[PDB]
Amino acid sequence: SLLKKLLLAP
Amino acid sequence: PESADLRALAKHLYDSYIKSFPLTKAKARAILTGKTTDKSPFVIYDMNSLMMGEDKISKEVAIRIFQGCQFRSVEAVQEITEYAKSIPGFVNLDLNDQVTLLKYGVHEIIYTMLASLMNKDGVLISEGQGFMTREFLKSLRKPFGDFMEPKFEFAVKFNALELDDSDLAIFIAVIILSGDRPGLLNVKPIEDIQDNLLQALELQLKLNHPESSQLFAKLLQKMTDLRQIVTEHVQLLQVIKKTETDMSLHPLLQEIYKDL
Ligand SMILES: Cn1c(COc2cccc(C(=O)O)c2)nc2ccc(Oc3ccc(Cl)c(F)c3)cc21
Ligand SMILES: [Cl-]
Ligand SMILES: [Cl-]
Numbered sequence: 679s680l681l682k683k684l685l686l687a688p
Numbered sequence: 689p690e691s692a693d694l695r696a697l698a699k700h701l702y703d704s705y706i707k708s709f710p711l712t713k714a715k716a717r718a719i720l721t722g723k724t725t726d727k728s729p730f731v732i733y734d735m736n737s738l739m740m741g742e743d744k745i746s747k748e749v750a751i752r753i754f755q756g757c758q759f760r761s762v763e764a765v766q767e768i769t770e771y772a773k774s775i776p777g778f779v780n781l782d783l784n785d786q787v788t789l790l791k792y793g794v795h796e797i798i799y800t801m802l803a804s805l806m807n808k809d810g811v812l813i814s815e816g817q818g819f820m821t822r823e824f825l826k827s828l829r830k831p832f833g834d835f836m837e838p839k840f841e842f843a844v845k846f847n848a849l850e851l852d853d854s855d856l857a858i859f860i861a862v863i864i865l866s867g868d869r870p871g872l873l874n875v876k877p878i879e880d881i882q883d884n885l886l887q888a889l890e891l892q893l894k895l896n897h898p899e900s901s902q903l904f905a906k907l908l909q910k911m912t913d914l915r916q917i918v919t920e921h922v923q924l925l926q927v928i929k930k931t932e933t934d935m936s937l938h939p940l941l942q943e944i945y946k947d948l
Contacts (some may be wrong), residue, residue, distance in 0.1 A: 680940050681787045684769045685779075 694888045697776065698858055701888075704774035705857035708767050711815045712853050713804035719816050720807050729812060729819040738824075745818045750832040751935060753825070754928070757835070760813070762938045764798045765790070768864075775861050777881045785872050791944050792869040795921065796914040797860050803843035804856070811840075831927055838920055846910060849903065855896060858889040863911055922948065 706712065718724045730744045731737060738749060747755070769790055773779050778786065805812040810821040822840050826833045851859065865882035867875045893903045925945065929935070937945070 679787060680943050681765075681769070681790050682783060684766060685773065685783065685786050685790070 691891060694891050697884070697888045698854065698892050701775070701857040701861055702854045704771060705853060705860070708771035708774070709801065711805070713856060714853055716805050716812055716816065719812060726816070729816055731819050731821070733821040733824050741818055745814050750828045751932065753828065754832055754835060755935070758938055758941055761798055762940050764801070765794050765940060765944070768794050768797050771860070772864050775864065775881070777877065781877060782873050785874060785878065788869050788872055789864055789866065789878070791948065793864045793866060794944060795918040796863050799839055799842065799914055799917050800856070800860060800863070802839060803846045806840060806843040808844055831924060835924065838917055842913060842917055849906060852896070855892060858885060858892050859907055861885050862889055863914070
């Protein structure tokens, strides 16, 4: 998901 | 001491809050009370000034404004996500649970912070570049003219509590770490973090608002009030998507609004 992607970016 | 650590946690959250949110309540009230030295916000109070502001800061105005709020929401979700990642223990939670906490908690945080940019007469937009009057916002045709009244009503009462950015940083952290969100896989670690955050909020309020009787209890109630605001907002959305076609929703919001 998009939220997951935002969460993973340092 | 345990209390000393709760203050260090409070400070950590505040510093994180400052790094994640460009427009703080302190700066916002300065703009709203006319004390800032920066460029004054351009006031949008009617169709003509909206046109002028649209250059300073195809679709009908009502939809343009509604979609404008949606775009700001997309930006806010990203700021809130960055803030969440700074809450001790958050990034170590099951990743799907992090998603879940944000999915069900972001709007509650958006409306909390929106209150910081509002007064009885209007709301600051685009990081203080503009100020849109409350009257103009409700003068919009149906169903858009009722869109924000519930938020303004909440803000006036919320702002009467006079919280500052330090109080807000912890308040927001508590809400994000809500163990009762639907579908959480591991509630215990979330609850343990929130319990510590709640202890930090309690101490923060006792120290920062010593005379404010029952402020902690009042904030717990505001947390409940915020969920009701989101509930009404979601319902108004359905009513909008049920009559307003051709309206495309940002994918980030589509994800959040899905099964919610
Ligand atoms: C009212 N409002 C806010 C702040 O209010 C919010 C912000 C986020 C969510 C909600 C909400 O009710 O869900 C409300 N940001 C906005 C951004 C664009 C917007 O629409 C416009 C504002 C000025 C101009 Cl020149 C323009 F051409 C469009 C309205 C906005
Ligand atoms: Cl106010
Ligand atoms: Cl929920």
